[PDB]
Structures are given as C-alpha cells and as structure tokens.
Specification:
Length: 266
C-alpha cells in the first residue's frame, strides 16, 4: 500500500548530503510570536501533500543564527520548520521545552490561517523537535512530556538530569567528541543510555567542539543527511530512509556510533 506521508523523489546519499534537497524553500518571520521570543518559519513549495512540522531551539545565550542552517536544509526535503529565539537567552531547558511546544502550536494555528504562507501545508498530527545544548535538553523534555511527537534529534544536549528513561519517541542524539561545555560522558551518552523504550541513535562527531552541529559546521553533509533521514523515517514512517536513518556511517568524521531498535531497509 502507498504510504500517505511519503514525499519527494527516492533518496540517494548525494541528494541527502547536498546543501539543499529537491523542494524550493521560502521563509517568513512570525509577526506576533505566542509563548516564545521570535520565530522564522521555513516551508517547501508543492511538496505533494501536507508535511510534518519541526521546532528547533538554540542553547543558553544563543539565538536562531546558531541553529538556523537546519531550517532550509530540512524544509527542502519536505518539512515545515520553525527556528526560535527564547523569551530570554538565559531560559533553562524546561522553559525552552514549553516555548518549543508553543512554537509548534503556532505553526498549527498558522496552518489554519488563510492569510499565512503555510495555510493547509502542515499535517499537525506529525511533529518533531530539535535543539542545541539546553535547547537539546528542552527537546528531550518535550519528547518525554509529549509522546505524541514523532521524532526528536537534539545536538550536544544538556540537562541537569540525564534520566530520559520514559521517552518512547525515536531519538537521534548528535554528540561532539571533545565537548567541554556539555561533556559527552556526563550529558549526551548517559542521556542516550537512559532510553530503553525507543528507536534511538547516538552519533558522535570526531574531534567536535560543543558547536560541531551548529550553523557553519564542517560536517553539514553527514549531519544534514542524518537529521533529514531520521525525520523522514520517523515523522513520515518512510522506509525509503530506513538505511540512511539506521546505518553506521562508517566514516572517519564519526568517533562513536550506537543505535537501538533501528532496522535497515528490508
Ligand atoms: Cl546551553
């Protein structure tokens, strides 16, 4: 049977590693942000049907610029993406999670607003969360509080507590090998090891600083391929992406790879 959520051409490693996918992307600034500081919405033209929505949150002291490369990258593969600024750059992970969920609710409100460029473009039942550092911890909190979310892909996450054992949402953790801000051995890896109820993955970037997955990084081909593949596999149930989502990249750019409940394409 046809998967009703499958969008776009059949993927290749080259198409997923490119700076942009097949869809043309447009963007707008949210005029009156509700429950968060500011937002930019990225969306594809003629994706072939409604698409899922992803909300991305930066870390402590940081703004949209640090995570905005994901906006066009994911939207060009068939997603509506909102990148946000928080009410204060000093907000903690629980506050970042509340603001991330408020941003997804505003994308759902704009989907039902005839004057919005994303009117009727979103399947509001299929949503995902991403973010860096405290925004990564906020994404894990969003997944723990909202198991109705379809995917999570935080990067260099940090939270006071690394226990995310209740999470049932498919979660990809990008980690940065040499992170001295949210060290892998006390943040990303214990967070990954705590989750025994989900599809999950741990991808550690070789020699990476805490900022190894932020805008301007030198691994956008691999990181972008993995982020899009994970969101495609789990937000769209798209088994054309099972191998890209679940595979060990076998790359010199990766210093540690682990995955669970993640089957390759049969
Ligand atoms: Cl942070």
């Amino acid at each position: 049977q046809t998967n009703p959520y499958a969008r776009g051409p059949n993927p290749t490693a080259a198409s997923l590693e490119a700076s942009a996918g097949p869809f043309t992307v447009r963007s707008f600034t949210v005029s009156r942000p509700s429950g968060y500081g500011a937002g930019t919405v990225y969306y594809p033209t003629n994706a072939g049907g409604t698409v899922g929505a992803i909300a991305i949150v930066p870390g402590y002291t940081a703004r949209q610029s640090s995570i905005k490369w994901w906006g066009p990258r994911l939207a060009s593969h068939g997603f509506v993406v909102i990148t946000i600024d928080t009410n204060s750059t000093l907000d903690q992970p629980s506050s970042r999670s509340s603001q991330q969920m408020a941003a997804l609710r505003q994308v759902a409100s704009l989907n039902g607003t005839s004057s919005s460029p994303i009117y009727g473009k979103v399947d509001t039942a299929r949503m995902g969360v991403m973010g860096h550092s405290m925004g990564g911890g906020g994404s894990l909190i969003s997944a723990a509080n909202n198991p109705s979310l379809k995917a999570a892909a935080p990067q260099a996450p940090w939270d006071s507590s690394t226990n995310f054992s209740s999470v049932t949402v498919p979660t990809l953790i990008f980690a940065c090998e040499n992170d001295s801000i949210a060290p892998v051995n006390s943040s990303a890896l214990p967070i990954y090891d705590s989750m025994s109820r989900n599809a999950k993955q741990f991808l550690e970037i070789n020699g990476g600083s805490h900022f190894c997955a932020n805008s301007g990084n030198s691994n956008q081909a691999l990181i972008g391929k993995k982020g899009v593949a994970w969101m495609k596999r789990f937000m769209d149930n798209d088994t054309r992406y099972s191998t890209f989502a679940c595979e060990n990249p076998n790359s010199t750019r990766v210093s540690d790879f682990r995955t669970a409940n993640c089957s390759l394409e049969h």
